[PDB]
């Protein structure tokens, strides 16, 4: 098998994914986000940063391969 | 000075090594004097392996 | 208030200083950035040309810092400070030294900005680079700006 991880997100979905980080979970890393949204890791990171600048998400730890972030209001239940 | 040498003159199978040391001790002594006093203080018997070097800086 | 108006480079995390002074060198547009810059990798030890287009700035910034700290540090020693391991392949990794021309360019061009002088009075390493009153003032004010921005963070 291979995992096709999308290398672009449509301008149709973008801030819809960004504004609702809790779809990923209680804990956001490269791996979590890669799993949930089927986005390739580099873009996963870029998303992390974007929605971190956006006050939606906060850094717990950064170690060269490891991103650890949490959601501000807490995990907010889907749909 | 260390020289590490293989024991057997041959390739005879076990590798054994010889740690061969030669230690050199270097001392310095400084004097404030005139020539004759120097030649007085150097007047005694010394064991063979000793190197003695003398240098003279004038002082005013 | 005894919170110090003044802060030495020694009081400041070096990474910050470098990115900051590089910023200053861009805003100033005070550097030449030669032509061989485009086609050349840092050291002989590297497979890929640098990922930051700004390296010349960064490398120069850091360079100044080195010269601020270690005075009389000539090019070769810097090639070693600025060098790394190099994979020779199935041969063991071994130490390797940086390129010269880039570093010497950075020092020529930093004399040009009055931030370092070539010492003619050291009779050992003659024409080794030492920071100036001026360059010192400049670096120390960058450093201070930084350090205050740091103690401003509660």
């Amino acid at each position: 098998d291979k995992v096709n991880h999308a290398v672009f997100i449509e301008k149709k979905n973008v801030e819809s994914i960004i504004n609702n980080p809790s779809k990923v979970g209680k804990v956001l890393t490269v791996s979590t986000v890669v799993e949930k949204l089927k986005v390739n890791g580099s873009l996963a990171r870029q998303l992390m940063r974007t929605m971190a600048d956006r006050k939606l998400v906060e850094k717990v730890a950064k170690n060269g391969n490891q991103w650890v972030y949490s959601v501000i209001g807490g995990v907010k239940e889907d749909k | 000075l260390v020289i590490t040498v293989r024991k057997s003159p041959c390739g005879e199978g076990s590798k054994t090594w010889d740690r061969f040391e030669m230690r050199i001790y270097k001392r310095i002594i400084d004097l404030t004097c005139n020539v004759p006093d120097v030649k007085t203080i150097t007047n005694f018997r010394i064991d063979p392996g000793v190197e003695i070097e003398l240098t003279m800086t004038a002082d005013q | 208030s005894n919170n110090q108006s003044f802060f030495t480079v020694k009081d400041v995390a070096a990474a910050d200083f470098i990115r900051e002074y590089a910023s200053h060198l861009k805003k100033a547009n005070k550097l030449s950035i030669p032509e061989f810059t485009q086609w050349t990798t840092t050291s002989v030890a590297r497979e890929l040309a640098p990922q930051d287009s700004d390296w010349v700035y960064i490398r120069t910034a850091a360079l100044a810092r080195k010269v601020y700290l270690k005075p009389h540090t000539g090019i070769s020693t810097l090639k070693h400070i600025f060098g790394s391991n190099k994979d020779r392949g199935n041969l063991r990794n071994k130490h390797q030294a940086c390129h010269g021309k880039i570093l010497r360019w950075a020092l020529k061009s930093l004399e040009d900005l009055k931030i370092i002088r070539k010492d003619k009075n050291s009779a050992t390493k003659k024409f080794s680079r030492v920071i100036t009153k001026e360059g010192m003032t400049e670096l120390n004010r960058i450093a201070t700006q930084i350090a205050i921005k740091q103690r401003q963070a509660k």
Binding site: - | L1, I3, V5, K7, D18, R19, F20, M22, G49 | -
Partner: protein, 54 residues
């Protein structure tokens, strides 16, 4: 007309040197400028002043 004798350069490498004692070229010890093959050295070692403490 022996003119060609020994006329190949011995300037450097293995033939430039030899053991002062036994005249071996092989495994020569050049390290303190002592020019002695390993075996010959091992023999002279106490006369040269090289102790084994270790």
């Amino acid at each position: 007309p022996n003119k060609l004798w020994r006329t190949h350069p011995r300037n450097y490498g293995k033939d430039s040197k030899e053991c002062r004692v036994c005249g071996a070229r092989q495994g020569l010890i050049t390290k303190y400028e002592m020019m002695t093959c390993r075996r010959c050295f091992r023999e002279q070692a106490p006369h040269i002043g090289f102790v084994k403490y270790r």
